[PDB]
Amino acid sequence: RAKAKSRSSRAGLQFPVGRVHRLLRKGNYAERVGAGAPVYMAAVLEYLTAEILELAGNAARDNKKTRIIPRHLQLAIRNDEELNKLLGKVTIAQGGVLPNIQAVLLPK
């Protein structure tokens, strides 16, 4: 038998490809899953994951940390307008809120 090779490595991805291929056939979403479907999707999930982690990582650095906590994810998501929206209905456990104080409440 020819040597088996992981597909994630092959597609230049870190996210699993065969599995996504699989998951796309579940929940009864479509009878069949095309070969490029999970490849396309795995790239998307990985991309979005990176964007959140990068921004959260920057938040971690802003707070002089060596890691991401739920709070950093919240700050990252909200500061980034497009992620803010993508997850605009999402409640993050222990996310807190942005420190937005209305100007009319402040003295001179």
Binding site: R71, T91, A93, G96, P99, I101, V104, L105
Partner: protein
Amino acid sequence: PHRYRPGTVALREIRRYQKSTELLIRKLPFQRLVREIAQDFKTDLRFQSSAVMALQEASEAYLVGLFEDTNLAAIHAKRVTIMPKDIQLARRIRGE
């Protein structure tokens, strides 16, 4: 007899509570509130501790978002103090 003026502390608390992530509602009280509501649907019902927390965080998140809109309504009305009606307006606009 040093004092900090009205609004100095209020702003301070706002700063802090916006910053922190912890639950603001006492737990045993909240837990019991959940149960009292639950018993109106069904007696002898149980909860995982994680379920209660999940409810509490969602509950606080809801109220905070509500208060943000309430605050805006009060400001629109040229007022700092929020009144029951400002809550009602915000809710209504939201479809409640």
